[PDB]
């Protein structure tokens, strides 16, 4: 199965309440493995999964130096955008930044990412060809021209297609127990009378990994998408995920409905029916 590595960074200004807040997090597929928080006491990159914990001191020291350096770039960036939009120094602003790489089933480079947002909207993004940029507006065209002259896209491409993929594979191997695990969902249905002639049928999927899953209801084999309540996939807290789907049925028609489950950890898609 395909895999990914991602770094997510958030910077928030606090006019007059000290310097900006900066939070950095890193993930491998849906498992988080490191963090950095500018308000914390350590001032270092920190482990968030057991498998990265025994990387030696040279790894930790290098990641800490790099994440500090990114922090400071975001401190300057908040002032720069403030000038580009001619905003006051009294409002609170947010900068977000992401980068990553996806590899396929053969563990081979498939795609690379790098983009920024300002106050919740797209500002600038590297295109899929890893040579061009998408600028959201007039302010972002100024950044794009700067980055074109300094040949920033070339530098990003060597990281996304090279280094990113090499360390992703190394992580996949070292954390194999956690990261190469496939956990099939534990499923079951509940039935609850809401009235004297209707009932709620709920279809559950628990303790699964990874997060991706398809869970739907059918009536006589026909799609019921507009009458199904589907909750967002969510974390159980122990490294696994959960999800449910429900439909309100007329009493007497329970047998017409089927719950369909699809996931990587299942040998064949599942079909459940209350009966």
């Amino acid at each position: 199965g395909s895999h990914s590595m991602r770094y997510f960074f958030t910077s928030v200004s606090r006019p007059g309440r000290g310097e900006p807040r900066f939070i950095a997090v890193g993930y491998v597929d849906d498992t988080q493995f490191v963090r950095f928080d500018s308000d914390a006491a350590s001032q270092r990159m920190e482990p968030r999964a057991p498998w990265i914990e025994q990387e030696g001191p040279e790894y930790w020291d290098g990641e800490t130096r790099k994440v500090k350096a990114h922090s400071q770039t975001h401190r300057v960036d908040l002032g720069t955008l403030r000038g580009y939009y001619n905003q006051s120094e009294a409002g609170s602003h947010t900068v977000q930044r992401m980068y990553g790489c996806d590899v396929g089933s053969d563990w081979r480079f498939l795609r690379g990412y790098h983009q920024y947002a300002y106050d919740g909207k797209d500002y600038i993004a590297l295109k899929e060809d890893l040579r061009s940029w998408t600028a959201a507006d007039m302010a972002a065209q100024t950044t794009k021209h700067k980055w074109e002259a300094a040949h920033v896209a070339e530098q990003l491409r060597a990281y996304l297609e090279g280094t990113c993929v090499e360390w992703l594979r190394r992580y996949l191997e070292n954390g194999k127990e956690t990261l190469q695990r496939t956990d099939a969902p534990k499923t079951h249905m509940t039935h609850h009378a809401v009235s004297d002639h209707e009932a709620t049928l709920r279809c559950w999927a628990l303790s699964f990994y990874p997060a991706e899953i398809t869970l739907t209801w059918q009536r006589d084999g026909e799609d019921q998408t507009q009458d199904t309540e589907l909750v967002e996939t969510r974390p159980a807290g122990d490294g696994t995920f959960q999800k449910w789907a429900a439909v309100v049925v007329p009493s007497g028609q329970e047998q017409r409905y089927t719950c369909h489950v699809q996931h990587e950890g299942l040998p064949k898609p599942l079909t459940l029916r209350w009966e």
């Binding site: 890193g26 770039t73 280094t163």
Partner: peptide
Amino acid sequence: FAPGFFPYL
């Protein structure tokens, strides 16, 4: 492993 090049907007 995080990138070690830090560009500015």
